């Protein structure tokens, strides 16, 4: 089996896995919509009672399976629990990362395209009216991704966006095709430092933004000022947990696959903790100190929250660059922004394609080249659905990146810490560890976390089951149909692998 060259490379690789678009795009929106500071508390709690334990658990499962030449959940679940149904459940460990990759890589390509156009200086040129200043950039984004006037099902992506998507795929491939240490690790050792530097620079530059309408410091205060009136709102907790799952790459089967390339004797406790901590730092300190503080700086708190509620891509692709365009050298600043977004996105995407690649290598005994090329082909082909169908991206992100990750987290936790055995699981987690996990977390992994995830899934189900059947748009049905098809396909591949074993 292939392994990580150095411990530093491993750390930066996992960090590259976690630190992504979710830190600089999703987090600011989630925090703004949930009352800033009021969102932090639950967040932190969700990080302590869900993020960390699941992180360690996925590291342990990953290394455990990897020691036996298996990097994906279809086989690992079976190793932990002898049953076909365990493999069937394991299919999600490929389905989720594949589906998520499908649109994630596309958004990444967006950030790349914007990076290029902003570098070359091909951007809209605003003239004191906000709606105005924002309009040109809105039209810019809409022209880029081909957004219809009213609410129409067909998207008309520009040729440039398509070509840039091809390029993005090419970059992902060029990295993944080299392998774990030659490809992912090498790239991480550069992209990560670059990312942190750009992030810090942007943070400082944004902090210097001050106008008659507000300052960045106001944004920082709003984000770090506690509010206990929202603690009774279940939605805030749900959003916190969801953000934790998303930002830590939990339930995506990515952490596991990355961990399968960690030598059996190497520690996964301190390494995992370090990766998670790095992610949280990049999220609450870097991600939260850019978009929101700027929006508040220019338009104020209220308007910033409104914009945040307007959409996820509205803040990162429209509002922020529109704000930068009003400052000296704002175009270049925008470039730095989108470049940062690009490196983060890429460092995540390779991580979410590695599960499929790894399955092709370990179970179907395909070479790395073939595995990478076929995975790339599948993702690229499937991407057209996201590119040309409106509301498709949202549907995939919902079924895979929202419900699926939680369901899968609960599933893996139950299989590893209950069926496989709590004591054996614990011993497996701590074994070889440079530091030992606090005893309390034991009781946290066995009782608290699973209970939380269960309750969450129950509420979600209760709320969505009636809405699902009654949905007008046909694009969502096409998407559902297709991703179901993907699930059947992966199940079939698992079947073929199983038959090959015999």
Ligand X SMILES: CC(C)C[C@H](N)C(=O)O
- Which stretches of 311-447 are DSSP H helices? 313-314, 320-324, 330-362, 368-388, 392-398, 405-414, 422-430, 439-443
In the complex, the smallest distance separating the C-beta of residue 34 from ligand X, rounded to whole angstroms, is 17
Site for ligand CCCCCCCCCCC in 195-214 (CB under 6 A): 197-198
What is the C-alpha to C-alpha distance for residues 114 and 122, in angstroms, rounded to an integer?
9
3-state secondary structure of 476: helix
Q: Is 391 left (phi over 0), alpha (psi -120 to 50) or beta?
A: left
| Residue 189 interface partner, choices ligand CCCCCCCCCCC, ligand X, Na ion, none, CB cut-off 5-8 Å depending on type | ligand CCCCCCCCCCC
Taking the least distance from each CB to Na ion, the nearer of 17 and 215 is 17
**How many CA atoms, within 13 angstroms, populate the side-chain half-sphere of residue 105?**
34
**Which among 339, 282, 304, 154 has a CA at the least distance from the CA of 221?**
304
Interacting stretch for ligand X, rule CB under 6 A, among 18-26, 63-71, 148-156, 421-429?
18-26
Taking the least distance from each CB to ligand X, the nearer of 297 and 410 is 410
What is the C-alpha to C-alpha distance for residues 128 and 292, in angstroms, rounded to an integer?
20
Q: Is 122 left (phi over 0), alpha (psi -120 to 50) or beta?
A: beta
Residue 319, token pair as written in the block: 């509002």
Radius of gyration for the chain, computed over Cα atoms and rounded to the nearest angstrom: 22
Q: How many residues bind ligand X (CB under 6 A)?
A: 14
Residues, the chain, total? 502
Site string for ligand X, 82-121 (x = CB under 6 A): ------------------x---------------------
Site for ligand X in 417-476 (CB under 6 A): none
What is the C-alpha to C-alpha distance for residues 265 and 246, in angstroms, rounded to an integer?
29
What is the C-alpha to C-alpha distance for residues 235 and 238, in angstroms, rounded to an integer?
5
| Residue 21 interface partner, choices Na ion, ligand X, ligand CCCCCCCCCCC, none, CB cut-off 5-8 Å depending on type | ligand X
Interacting stretch for ligand CCCCCCCCCCC, rule CB under 6 A, among 47-55, 106-114, 186-194, 469-477?
186-194
| 353 near Na ion, judged by CB under 5 A | no
- Which stretches of 73-91 are DSSP H helices? 73-80, 84-90
Interacting stretch for Na ion, rule CB under 5 A, among 21-29, 50-58, 214-222, 381-389?
21-29
Residue 81, token pair as written in the block: 């629990």
Site string for ligand X, 47-86 (x = CB under 6 A): ----------------------------------------
| Residue 223 interface partner, choices ligand CCCCCCCCCCC, Na ion, ligand X, none, CB cut-off 5-8 Å depending on type | none
| 174 near ligand CCCCCCCCCCC, judged by CB under 6 A | no
In the complex, the smallest distance separating the C-beta of residue 105 from ligand X, rounded to whole angstroms, is 11
Site string for ligand X, 291-330 (x = CB under 6 A): ----------------------------------------
| 306 near ligand CCCCCCCCCCC, judged by CB under 6 A | no
Asked if 316 and 24 count as a contact pair (C-beta separation under 8 A), the reply is: yes
Angle of CA points 366, 372, 374, to nearest 5°: 80
**Cβ neighbours of 127 (radius 10 Å):** 8
Site string for ligand X, 222-261 (x = CB under 6 A): ------------------------xx-x--x-x-------
Taking the least distance from each CB to ligand X, the nearer of 279 and 392 is 279
**Which among 58, 53, 23, 7 has a CA at the least distance from the CA of 279?**
23
Report residue 36: phi and psi, to 5°: 60, -110
DSSP letters of 243-291?
HHHHHTTTTSSHHHHHHTTS-TTS-SHHHHHHHHHHHHIIIIIIGGGTH
Interacting stretch for ligand CCCCCCCCCCC, rule CB under 6 A, among 192-200, 215-223, 278-286, 468-476?
192-200
In the complex, the smallest distance separating the C-beta of residue 155 from Na ion, rounded to whole angstroms, is 25
Taking the least distance from each CB to ligand X, the nearer of 276 and 494 is 276
Is 84 labelled a binding residue? yes
What is the C-alpha to C-alpha distance for residues 95 and 363, in angstroms, rounded to an integer?
16
Binding site for Na ion (CB under 5 A): 16, 18, 20, 22-23, 247, 279, 344, 347-348
Binding site for ligand CCCCCCCCCCC (CB under 6 A): 189-190, 193-194, 197-198
Binding site for ligand X (CB under 6 A): 18, 20-23, 100, 246-247, 249, 252, 254, 348, 351-352
């Amino acid at each position: 089996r292939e392994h990580w060259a150095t411990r530093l490379g491993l750390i930066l690789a996992m960090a590259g896995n976690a630190v992504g678009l979710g830190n600089f795009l999703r987090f600011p929106v989630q925090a703004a919509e949930n009352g800033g500071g009021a969102f932090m508390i639950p967040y932190i709690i969700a990080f302590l009672l869900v993020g960390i334990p699941l992180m360690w658990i996925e590291w342990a499962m990953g290394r455990y399976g990897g020691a036996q030449g298996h990097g994906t959940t279809p086989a690992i679940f079976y190793l932990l629990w002898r049953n076909r149904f365990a493999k069937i459940l394991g299919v999600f460990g490929l389905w989720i990362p594949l589906v998520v990759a499908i649109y994630y890589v596309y958004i990444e390509s967006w950030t790349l395209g914007f990076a290029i156009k902003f570098l070359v200086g091909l951007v809209p040129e605003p003239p004191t009216d906000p709606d105005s200043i924002l309009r040109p950039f809105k039209e810019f984004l809409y022209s880029y991704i081909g957004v219809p006037k009213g609410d129409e099902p067909i998207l008309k992506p520009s040729l440039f966006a398509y070509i840039v998507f091809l390029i993005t795929m090419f970059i992902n491939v060029s990295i993944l095709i080299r392998g774990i240490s030659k490809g992912i690790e090498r790239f991480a050792k550069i992209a990560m430092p670059t990312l942190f530097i750009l992030a810090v620079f942007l943070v400082i530059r944004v902090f210097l933004l001050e106008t008659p309408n507000g300052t960045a410091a106001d944004g920082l205060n709003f984000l770090w000022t506690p509010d206990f009136e929202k603690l009774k709102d279940p939605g805030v907790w749900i959003a916190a947990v969801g953000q934790i799952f998303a930002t830590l790459s939990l339930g995506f089967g990515a952490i596991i696959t990355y961990a399968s390339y960690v030598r059996k004797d190497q520690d996964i406790v301190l390494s995992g903790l370090t990766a998670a901590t790095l992610n949280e730092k990049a999220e609450v300190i870097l991600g939260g100190s850019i978009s929101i503080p700027a929006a508040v700086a220019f338009f104020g708190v209220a308007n910033a929250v409104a914009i945040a509620k307007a959409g996820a891509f509205n803040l990162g692709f429209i509002t922020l660059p529109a704000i930068f365009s009003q400052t000296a050298g704002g175009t270049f600043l925008g470039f730095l922004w989108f470049f940062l977004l690009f490196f983060a996105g890429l460092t995540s995407s390779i991580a979410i394609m590695q599960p499929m690649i790894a399955f092709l290598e370990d179970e179907l005994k395909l070479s790395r080249k073939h595995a990478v090329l076929w995975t790339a082909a599948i993702v690229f082909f499937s991407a057209h659905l996201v590119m040309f169908l409106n509301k498709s991206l949202d549907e995939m992100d919902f079924w895979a990146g929202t419900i699926g990750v939680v369901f899968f987290g609960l599933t893996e936790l139950i299989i590893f810490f209950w069926i496989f055995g709590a004591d054996k699981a614990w011993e497996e987690i701590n074994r070889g560890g440079i530091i030992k996990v606090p005893r309390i977390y034991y009781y946290v992994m066995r009782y608290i976390t699973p209970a939380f995830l269960a309750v969450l899934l129950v509420v979600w189900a209760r709320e969505y089951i009636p809405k699902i059947m009654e949905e007008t748009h046909w694009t969502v049905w096409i998407t559902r149909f297709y991703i179901i098809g993907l699930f059947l396909f992966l199940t079939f591949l698992v079947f073929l692998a199983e038959r090959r074993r015999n």
